[PDB]
Ligand binder design. Structure first.
Ligand SMILES: Cc1cc2nc3c(=O)[nH]c(=O)nc-3n(C[C@H](O)[C@H](O)[C@H](O)COP(=O)(O)O)c2cc1C
Ligand SMILES: Cc1cc2nc3c(=O)[nH]c(=O)nc-3n(C[C@H](O)[C@H](O)[C@H](O)COP(=O)(O)O)c2cc1C
Ligand SMILES: O=C(O)/C=C/C(=O)O
Ligand SMILES: O=C(O)/C=C/C(=O)O
Lengths: 312, 312
């Protein structure tokens, strides 16, 4: 019985990693994720220049999940590139580097500089097309023409395999169109489903107030709220992109949740809200719990059940 | 202290009603809703001809909410129109009739016949632009040009005030556009936010199977999953449609949840999943609980806190 995977020309001890944005902004964070039992890690989505992000309070967690409007606070692309070039211990686990430039030009600028490091070190690009928290910037992948432009420009400028972080969709027509756009791009080797469910609103009944400051309280939702949404998107893209990998993200708190993501089609499984709340000790627990479910079912490897969800 | 209110030239004993689709398909259901302590009722979304709907199982409930792909099973518009014209006791409470034709032409045909009954009896139209469960028919209100066409043609054919059942949105640009489309039509006096969060997927770990049969298990989500999304949409439309009413729907299980919807801007509060699971006794409990929160806070009227959610 084993959780090992071999994909994108890298070997992973198990399918778990942080979700971008959680425990991955500073060198301290990345060293922590590296020391954890996770199979991989991804750095904070970055911009060309450092950013302070949105005003605080900008994250709050509750029993059923979290809301945030961080606003892409990050140490800047130079930092994450240097981390990937000089600092990361690749003998420990593979590293993904997430970028979220505020325009196609900014993304293109960054990937031109990332390319030689990706060639040399094997760092893997996750292009974030789904940030719902920057005031005035709608989610790129909710505009299919813009999505195509970004992917055309990034494919041309980068020229290496990469992946895309996708927003959740809620309409079969959108699954069909989105997956078809992705299928136009052979360098897109993995699709991460999903980013936060955008622009939710938590209100505290006692204070009669929204709980985060940016955007009049409107922020991305994660955690228990989003699991069925996340599984639907994982499965929709798994079915529609048979020549790509799908990484699952959304609502994972237990090895059972990870098991459902894998049944739905997930290769790697990312942990956001639960990791933010529990800390990196979560990775040993999710590993044990997934192996227990596999043991009980007689599954010896992940491939034995990946994408094997039954329909009626 | 009582929760009585006036809206749309009708008087309501309290802001509570069923959500369309729940406990409202047959004469028996409608008689049951009428005998309940709800302030109003709405009939099942209907089509010109009766429909058997999607294959069973097609509804499932869980601690955090529900998933369904009913597929508009209904007794046909002739039945709901007859209920409105001949059978409903308007001395008990107001009635909303929901229609969900599968084309603009179908909706136009229905509203032309509804008009004389609305003139005589005061039945209120809720035009459903957000059914996410009929195979091959995308949610109308996710296509803004289609949404405009439907509202143009219905406004012209019907000529009387009406309301619209909206899908949830997740992008500030979409809130802006959707509300601007709605604001083009002075006959649209109310906006119901929200219909189900479309096309989620629930998977049972033990059986390794989806839990509903239609559309490979993909169905609309309601219940605790969707409360922050519901509140966001209620508030977004409340802010952008100052000259219309917003009815809140999504995630109501308690007087506290109703209190939050009303703080976000809700005039009426609809109850779907919780009503499906608890039954019509829920309305007395919700009234008691809302009155208790109001008393504790020193509020004597709904108008005192409606839309008064505080930002930071
Ligand atoms: C604190 C916070 C910051 C995040 N920052 C990013 C980000 O930088 N890039 C990104 O793609 N997603 C970001 N996310 C979204 C997560 O990666 C993930 O998609 C989302 O939280 C859903 O997963 P969950 O249900 O496990 O939380 C962030 C989420 C939160 C909670
Ligand atoms: C069994 C089922 C049937 C529904 N049928 C309709 C329908 O006919 N028309 C409609 O506008 N909404 C329908 N809905 C969606 C609800 O009206 C409501 O918008 C949704 O369930 C979210 O509210 P909730 O969280 O209280 O469940 C239905 C929901 C369920 C649970
Ligand atoms: O930093 C943030 O606001 C989150 C971005 C994201 O969810 O992509
Ligand atoms: O009958 C249904 O499938 C539900 C429709 C809706 O949510 O509008």
């Amino acid at each position: 019985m084993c959780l090992k995977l071999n994909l994108l020309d890298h070997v992973f001890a198990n399918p778990f990693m942080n979700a971008a944005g959680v425990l991955c902004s500073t060198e301290e964070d990345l060293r922590c994720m590296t020391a954890s039992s996770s199979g991989a890690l991804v750095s904070k989505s970055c911009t060309s220049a450092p950013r302070d992000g949105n005003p605080e309070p900008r994250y709050m967690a509750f029993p059923l999940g979290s809301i945030n409007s961080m606003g892409l606070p990050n140490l800047g692309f130079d930092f994450y590139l240097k981390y990937a070039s000089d600092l990361h211990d690749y003998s420990k686990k593979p590293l993904f580097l997430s970028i979220s430039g505020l325009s196609v030009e900014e993304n293109v600028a960054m990937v031109r500089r990332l390319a030689p490091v990706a060639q040399e070190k094997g760092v893997l690009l996750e292009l974030n097309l789904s940030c719902p928290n920057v005031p005035g910037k709608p989610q790129v992948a909710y505009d299919f023409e813009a999505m195509r432009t970004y992917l055309q420009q990034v494919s041309l400028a980068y020229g290496l395999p990469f992946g895309v972080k996708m927003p959740p969709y809620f309409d079969i027509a959108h699954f069909d169109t989105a997956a078809a756009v992705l299928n136009e791009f052979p360098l897109v080797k993995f699709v991460t489903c999903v980013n936060s469910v955008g622009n939710g609103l938590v209100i505290d009944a006692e204070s009669e107030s929204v709980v985060i400051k940016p955007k009049q309280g409107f922020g991305g939702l994660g955690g228990k709220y989003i699991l069925p949404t996340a599984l639907a998107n994982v499965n929709a893209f798994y079915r529609r992109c048979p020549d790509k990998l799908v990484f699952g993200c959304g609502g994972v708190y237990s090895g059972e949740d990870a098991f459902l993501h894998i049944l739905a089609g997930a290769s790697m499984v990312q942990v956001g809200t639960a990791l933010q709340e529990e800390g990196p000790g979560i990775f040993t627990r999710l590993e044990d719990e997934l192996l227990e479910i596999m043991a009980r079912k007689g599954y010896r490897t992940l491939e034995e059940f990946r994408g094997r969800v039954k329909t009626i």
